[PDB]
Amino acid sequence: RQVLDLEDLVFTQGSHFMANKRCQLPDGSFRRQRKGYEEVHVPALKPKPFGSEEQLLPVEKLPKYAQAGFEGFKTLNRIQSKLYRAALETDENLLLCAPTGAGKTNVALMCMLREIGKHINMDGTINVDDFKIIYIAPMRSLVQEMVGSFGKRLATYGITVAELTGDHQLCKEEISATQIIVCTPEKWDIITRKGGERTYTQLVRLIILDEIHLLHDDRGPVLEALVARAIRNIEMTQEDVRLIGLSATLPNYEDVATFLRVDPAKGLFYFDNSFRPVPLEQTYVGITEKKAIKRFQIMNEIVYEKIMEHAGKNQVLVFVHSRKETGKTARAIRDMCLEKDTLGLFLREGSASTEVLRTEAEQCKNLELKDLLPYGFAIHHAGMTRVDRTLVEDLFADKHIQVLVSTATLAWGVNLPAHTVIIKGTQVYSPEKGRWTELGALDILQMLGRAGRPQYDTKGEGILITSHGELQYYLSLLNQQLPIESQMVSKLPDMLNAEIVLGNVQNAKDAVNWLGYAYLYIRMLRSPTLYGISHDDLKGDPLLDQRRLDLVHTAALMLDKNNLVKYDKKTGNFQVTELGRIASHYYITNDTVQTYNQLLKPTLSEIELFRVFSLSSEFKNITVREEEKLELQKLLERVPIPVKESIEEPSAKINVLLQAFISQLKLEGFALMADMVYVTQSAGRLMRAIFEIVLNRGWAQLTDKTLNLCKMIDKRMWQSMCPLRQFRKLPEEVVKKIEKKNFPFERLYDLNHNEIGELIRMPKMGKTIHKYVHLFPKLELSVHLQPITRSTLKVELTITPDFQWDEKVHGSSEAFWILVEDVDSEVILHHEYFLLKAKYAQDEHLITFFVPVFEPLPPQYFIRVVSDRWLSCETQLPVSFRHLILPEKYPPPTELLDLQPLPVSALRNSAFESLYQDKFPFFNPIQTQVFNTVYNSDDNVFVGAPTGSGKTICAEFAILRMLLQSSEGRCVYITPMEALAEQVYMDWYEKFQDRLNKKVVLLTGETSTDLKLLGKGNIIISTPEKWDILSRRWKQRKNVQNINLFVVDEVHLIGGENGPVLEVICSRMRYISSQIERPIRIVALSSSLSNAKDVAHWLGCSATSTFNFHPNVRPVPLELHIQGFNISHTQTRLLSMAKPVYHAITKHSPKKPVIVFVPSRKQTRLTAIDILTTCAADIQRQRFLHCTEKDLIPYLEKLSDSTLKETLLNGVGYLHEGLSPMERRLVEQLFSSGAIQVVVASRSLCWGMNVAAHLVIIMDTQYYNGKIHAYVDYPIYDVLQMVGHANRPLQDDEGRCVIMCQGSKKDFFKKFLYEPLPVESHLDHCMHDHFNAEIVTKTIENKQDAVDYLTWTFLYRRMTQNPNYYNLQGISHRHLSDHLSELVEQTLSDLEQSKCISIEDEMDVAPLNLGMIAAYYYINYTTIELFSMSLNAKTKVRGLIEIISNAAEYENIPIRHHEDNLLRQLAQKVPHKLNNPKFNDPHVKTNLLLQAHLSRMQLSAELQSDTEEILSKAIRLIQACVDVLSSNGWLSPALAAMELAQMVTQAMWSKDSYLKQLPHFTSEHIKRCTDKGVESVFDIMEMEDEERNALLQLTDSQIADVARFCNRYPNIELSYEVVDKDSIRSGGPVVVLVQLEREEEVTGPVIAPLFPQKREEGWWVVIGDAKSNSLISIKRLTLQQKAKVKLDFVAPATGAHNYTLYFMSDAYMGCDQEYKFSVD
Amino acid sequence: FKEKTVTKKRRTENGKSRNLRQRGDD
């Protein structure tokens, strides 16, 4: 590749550079020169004679839906008649080359109507949200008129059109709202660069490039980039987008058609000047005058002379370059005609006020139009008034204003044709060019289009005034002899940077291909010699691939030199540096970046900042005009900031101009205005980018100064003056009076309105100002810091808004920057973006982040929250370190001995060796080192190794030693995750029970089954909760006491959630081992821990038997790559992150398995489809599938989902909770077998996987939390476990993990992932339940016992090592004792408050009844307190459901995004309505789901899983409610609760008839059952089979299974007897004996169809008194075959009473028996 | 807005009181 000089290659002078060589003039033309100028007149060409069978299309002759939007028109014109077929019937790319004013906008509307007609829906409605149309217009003044006209035309379709102007966030909502977006090429391009088009890019079906010939105007870069991007996007995503280009008649149009992907045979329509609907004569004038004054003098009489030709017969429209020139020209022409011979007599032609009367009536204006209007003259320009412009428009439309001079905005801004139009000057000032340049070609064409009214004009000539030196160009342009060329060459590097930032071109090859779609490539192909390419060079490479490579190399080296993008010569890959990303985002040329880099420094002063801004390459051309040099001087001494290093250079001019704009100084000079505008609009971008540039480098001072300058530029304010000017409503003089007082703003907050008024001496508005004081944003900050390690902290920041929210002043949301700065305050340790939404205002927000520290602790860190667009709106909080105790430094990890690998034959027993000899002959070094200690010694051991090191083999070593020690022994393996428990159970069932014939069991929910399994089994797999339930009452249960081995897995999880339970059970096992006088060996397995010594001491592991290995001792070396993206919005983040997933897959693991973990189940499908479409984009198709589809078909037939079936056929599969377990098993088997290569899994499924891959990708490291309504990071243990999956030891030499995260968390991941992490106990927060449980079982009998019991926990070990993490002040034994005493005192006080325990003498504690209920069912104590408080003696099933849904166990249920709409829809469906509920409250969701499930209705499958979880947790809560109600002695609420249990298991309302229990039954079946007389299942059990058959439609299965259910339905017969009912007296005990029999022998569990989990029959026997609503006695039982139950109570007074005995089920409705008996 | 999900010979009998609790129009 060679370096080509861009400057030589590019043709200069912009649009003026003419490819035309000679400009042959048409036959109907002539040229004539008088005095110093020459006029060339080309009469209107007669319209082309209509061809045979050619006729204009009647409006009624087109499709009916398109009839609307064409009202007021009799027929389409000739051009529209030609193009209607292609526009409306075919979906083909179009290029219409017609003369201006020929109605090309209507062709665009026909295309838009086509796109609309693709969505006619039904009943004359349009799918509003199904499509979007992009209309690109060159001039904003045209954009507004396009918006207005299209809104008027397309109103009947219910379709909204709007301009795209505004802030990007405002643009986001604007686009989402509307369907047709009209915008400028620059606006659309910048929105695309910013990524704002990403969300709706799939809804854009039609794009219209109006005035597509503009390319030559040096906007060609902006437009070419857009079109090439769209075409290349079409090829990449295979999606179809239709492009409609509208152009003027010009040479080489076929090249544009090729560039537009337009078929010349079908989609190309070209019309010459003849096709002009209304004939017009083009009249050019060229002045040869050299000196400016005489040339300008000549122009006046030129205009006057031509004006007099159509003085009395034709409305003349004159155009002028500038807004002020309009009135000057009007006054000059009026004076010229009046002074000489008074030509104005007929130039107005009042004809005795035949027409003038209207203008004489309309003279009542208040502008300079008042003078001109009576004479017939008028001026129309931007500004004036809105009413004035429409007035002059309407008055001109009625043929009143004979002569109207206007600006260029009239042509675009409103359809106002005229007979004769004359353009004067054709010389406009360009601020970008910093000089006077001739106006754009396109503007000339558009202006000429207006000339000639469509139906009132036979032919109207048009006149142009220009210098004679530029005549040919104009001629060449309007005689269609001037071809269109490309200016891509000059602007190339910026376009390349935009592409690289977008990610379209990863490597230089992609950029070389990308140039293939550019119009520059086509032009170089057609005319190589024009673009600096020799003919022999053209013959060299036909496609010029080498040429493109050359330019790519040059641009890449230039960009690398500025460090915008890293470029490597060896391969050619492009690496996006962050600076380049900023530059692309803010339209900054590479030179400006090269200047900022060598100018910006951390110590820049404000003056120096303004100077640095002035040197931007955007203004590299601007100069200082001498005529305005005097004026600049008076501005200089008025601006606040001194401007040094300035002698009135361009930098000085820019600096003083910007300062004047900020200070809102008025200026008297026209020229400055242009410059004044150009800098200001520019400044807003640059000042932001600089901020970004300095925000990333973490410069604390310069960032604050730059952000303050951005806010000043936006608000036109100086920080010195009062911030209250930010409210436009406040009267200026009042704010000036406030500023006169040297009264600081914050002191306003504490003053009342009357005090404010008397301070300002204007009490009348003193209240209003007060209001504004409380409208200013203000936050309150609190900081809670915890030292995680010796080097890093964890700071939680609580933000509390302290201001009334007003949607007018504030808006939909507010933005803030959180900055953490060191003691010097010269560097930013950590920065973050915070968004305060309007909906969640006045709600405390919690933000947790990690900041680093160093060994010499500085006194303070400063936390500053700074508003993003409000001045003087910062809040600073000093975080102090004078009382901080860092954690003790951890000892070095255990070194890895280089021992000789251990053969499997080391194990003595051959049977044991048979277990492993097949898999491998040698152990990995970790287990070779551990084997001696574990297998050959009997003592507690701790093994800390990175996950994937086979610690389970060490656990099996311990188990084998136990089996060798005793033939029958018990081992208990506790693993924190349920899915891990299942996996381990399967593995050891394969390994132990099958080969060694030793019992292996897995614990379940039911306590009796758990007891049976513990009694019979030898290996007991369990999770912390399941084992906790059993071990709580270890004193009574002998089996728990004597177990030979206790293995804990994932010991490090105790730090995370569900850690307290694991810690409690481990401590209880240690206590049992100490108490039983028979040591219980403990084997702990965990990831590498920094504080391994604390855990080993806690579990009793000796110093020599503690193994803690570094994370670098992984058997398979791990390569971790963290990729940080600086995007705050989550959806935008993921949408931009989708492509780097595929790029990383290609770069790292091309031909090896890949696993991608995403945040949410919904996101899984989208990511799988996006990766698939990106793969199909690339040259290699379905490379992710290695097997054959014939082998896939047997597997695919088992699948049910359609999207998953489609994805598998290409080689990508996805896993989530929704998939059936069979489907997940099949996909995991497919992935393991190597058929597919990439699997996308939901992160919540990470634990439950048995498949490992060569590459693991982490998608976002964040997830949405609905309860907190915020995004939270993954737990570090969770992320580490995900990283552990990249472990294939047999084949892969190393594993690779790419973690892609937000840039804020990037440093923290580096800190923790690489080396051992610390674990801290959270037992202090979740301690009430455990103390209650211990008190229930009499383990704790007083406060001293609880204090002693706390010593066994890991919390007691940590509090003496990391004190400040647990709010400890000191480290002495006294401080620890005081903290333990205070903590236990608080917990026992809470328990006494909830009546769980009784505290006597402030020393002893005893268990109360509520405590026994809470501990018996393993229910959180808060829930039992709530049940006790809320339940009364009159609650029905409605109140019971409401109470149960309020239980604490449902607090952790998830609230996903967008669920609120579905939930609000569901809330109406349910039978019982709530009382104004908050739909983000989890309890409300649980109540709604319970009501939905009870009613048997079905919801969307995603929400369905939550219902299974809720029902799983519900039954114990219902039983607890029953127990509480029985304790309180209430009959009706207890019966209601029992019926609630029955109905929740059978999923039916109480009112609903019993029949609904039976399977395959419906309301119609039940109705046919009803009238017969069948109401209960028992009669069906008593139905002669034929009658059940004939009455009920059936199959084999319907009768078979329904009758079988009848068998399962429990019919049981009971007899009661009151023992010694004769010899009984008041106050004596009363005993009743009940006999229960089931002749049928029970087979299996309850047949619960809808209830997910398996359940058994539970029965309640209740003796009550119905009249008093009092529950005398109750007993729960389970009926196996038969039972003999005793009930007892105390007799009341006065002898005789009559109780009722209730026998109630809990799984089947209808079998509740009642028996009435008397006493005494 | 959504739909509602729906879902040998035994003649064994013995003389019995067969008393069940009334619905009570709960």
Residue numbers in the entry:
A (entry chain B): 406 to 2125
B (entry chain F): 336 to 342, 357 to 375
Sentences from the study reporting this entry:
For instance, the U5 snRNP 200 kDa helicase (SNRNP200; Brr2p in yeast) unwinds the initially extensively base-paired U4 and U6 snRNAs during spliceosome activation and releases U4 snRNA and all U4/U6-associated proteins, necessitating re-assembly of the U4/U6 di-snRNP and the U4/U6-U5 tri-snRNP after splicing. Both helicase cassettes comprise dual RecA-like NTPase domains, a winged helix (WH) domain, a helical bundle (HB) domain, a helix-loop-helix (HLH) domain and an immunoglobulin-like (IG) domain. Only the N-terminal cassette (residues 395–1324; SNRNP200NC) is an active ATPase/RNA helicase, while the C-terminal cassette (residues 1282–2136; SNRNP200CC) is catalytically inactive and serves as an intra-molecular regulator of the NC helicase activity.
FBP21 enters the spliceosome during formation of the pre-catalytic B complex together with seven additional B-specific proteins and leaves the spliceosome again during the following activation step, likely facilitating ordered transitions toward a catalytically competent spliceosome. Like TSSC4, both proteins also contact the SNRNP200 CC. Notably, the binding site of TSSC4 binding region 4 (residues 303–318) overlaps with a binding site of FBP21 and C9ORF78 regions at the Sec63 unit of the SNRNP200 CC. Moreover, all three proteins employ an F-R (F315-R316 in TSSC4; F8-R9 in C9ORF78) or L-R (L369-R370 in FBP21) motif to engage in similar contacts with the F1983, E1944 and E2119 residues of SNRNP200HR. This observation supports the idea that the SNRNP200 CC serves as a latching point for diverse intrinsically disordered proteins (IDPs) that either function during snRNP assembly (TSSC4) or during different stages of the splicing cycle (FBP21, C9ORF78). Mutually exclusive binding of the three proteins to SNRNP200 may serve to prevent premature interactions during U5 snRNP assembly (TSSC4) or support ordered recruitment of regulatory proteins during splicing (FBP21 and C9ORF78). Instead of full-length FBP21, we employed a C-terminal fragment (FBP21200–376) that encompasses the SNRNP200 CC-binding region. FBP21200–376 was fully displaced by GST-TSSC4 while, due to an excess of SNRNP200HR–C9ORF78 over GST–TSSC4 in case of the SNRNP200HR–C9ORF78/GST–TSSC4 mixture, a small amount of binary SNRNP200HR–C9ORF78 complex eluted from the SEC column in addition to SNRNP200HR–GST–TSSC4 and isolated C9ORF78.
